[PDB]
Symmetry: D2
């Protein structure tokens, strides 16, 4: 896994006193972006070129226990290529010090050619990076 | 239960790729849920304030079919189902109001738990009653 | 004033139990966008053209009392043109039923020519719309 | 007190105009404040949990000089000052880490109030102590 460290901020939380559900999914996307940056890939780069896009096409998340403002979390990310066009990120979000499981999530991402929005093969650079990140 | 929630896309909903950010569609789903609650005169805040129960969301999922842009007017169509004594399930479709183009489908699952022990409890009866929606066909 | 009605959602609130400070400023920008739309102006339009931009260059807000999830708020918006290039939106955020004052805010906005980002005169259509919205 | 908070711009921070949304800069300011608190082993959550006091933000302002984009690495430089027995003031500058281009300046003011009456109270001593910062020049 790639491990992304994330402190819970006040804005991540809601009036029930705990982290708001989709803020956990925000933390997941951050982990993904940080992994990209570590692999010298750049979401901004592909957006900027715009012969292609790499949209998220699915997200899902199960919640097991709440977190609170100030908590230090770890988001552990591993990724597998599901097909020519599509990869699947798996995330586990835990408390750093106890490894209490808070959530498990997936996001799926596809490459498309623009403007027609038709599936295109994942860039090899993404494929290569995904290979280096070991998935069960 | 069913509900149609009308939602304008604001600048903040969009991202640097020029389209609505994935997570903002899920936010709009929760808003539809909240608007339905309000229409049924139910209140998340009352649950929180009394502090005997919580109604955490325990699962969410969403699939994206097509993008939206700043200024678009969207419809979020919601159906609510009771899955167990303690759990209900919201099903959402998000579409363009004018063209009816389907942008996304989603689900959220919610459970009632007694606090502080966090053990499953029966849904509040008023909530069950709203979900049953016997007042409408 | 233009009056924008806004329900407080769970995501607007934080773990202290109340509306998070900058969510009030989000509601202000929404009121601004709704006013634009009512005047058949379009933030998306100017962004899309990109010979010009109309950025927010200042925001400030004072808080008087908290709000909670489920509250129904009114954001009252009035606007004055401060100079050739710049307008100033004033907002008052209150409880709908009691008119309890929650916050007062300002945002300032300027027109710039791109890509150089040099001040340009407000489009007359914006000037015209601003004139129709009465400011003390 | 002083602090330097390092912040990557994420896709969610940006909007459909292709730049960081104004309100997200203010979010980054509050994060700097929160990171400083953490570095001083202070906790907003502890205040909330105990429920004797609140530390609401009572004023915020921000001016924007230049935009940022997705992927940028920013520095938020924070200075904290005690303005009264019950009030402190955070001053922020946001810059590009590499070029040192100034993007924005901001201020937030915070007050301590006793609950439920919401009357001004003296800052918690540990907070005062952190702001005084006698351990550093």
């Amino acid at each position: 896994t790639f491990t992304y460290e994330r402190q819970v901020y006040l804005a991540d939380t809601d009036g029930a006193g705990v982290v708001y559900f989709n803020q956990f999914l925000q933390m997941c996307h951050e982990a993904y972006e940080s992994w990209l940056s570590s692999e010298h890939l750049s979401l901004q780069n592909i957006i900027s070129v715009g012969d292609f896009a790499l949209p998220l096409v699915h997200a899902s998340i199960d919640f097991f226990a709440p977190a609170h403002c100030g908590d230090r979390l770890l988001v552990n990310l591993t990724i597998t290529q599901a097909s020519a066009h599509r990869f699947c990120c798996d995330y586990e979000i835990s408390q750093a010090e106890s490894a209490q499981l808070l959530a498990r999530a997936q996001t799926h991402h596809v490459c498309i050619a623009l403007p027609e929005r038709k599936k295109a093969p994942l860039p090899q650079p993404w494929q290569t990076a995904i290979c280096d990140l070991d998935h069960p």
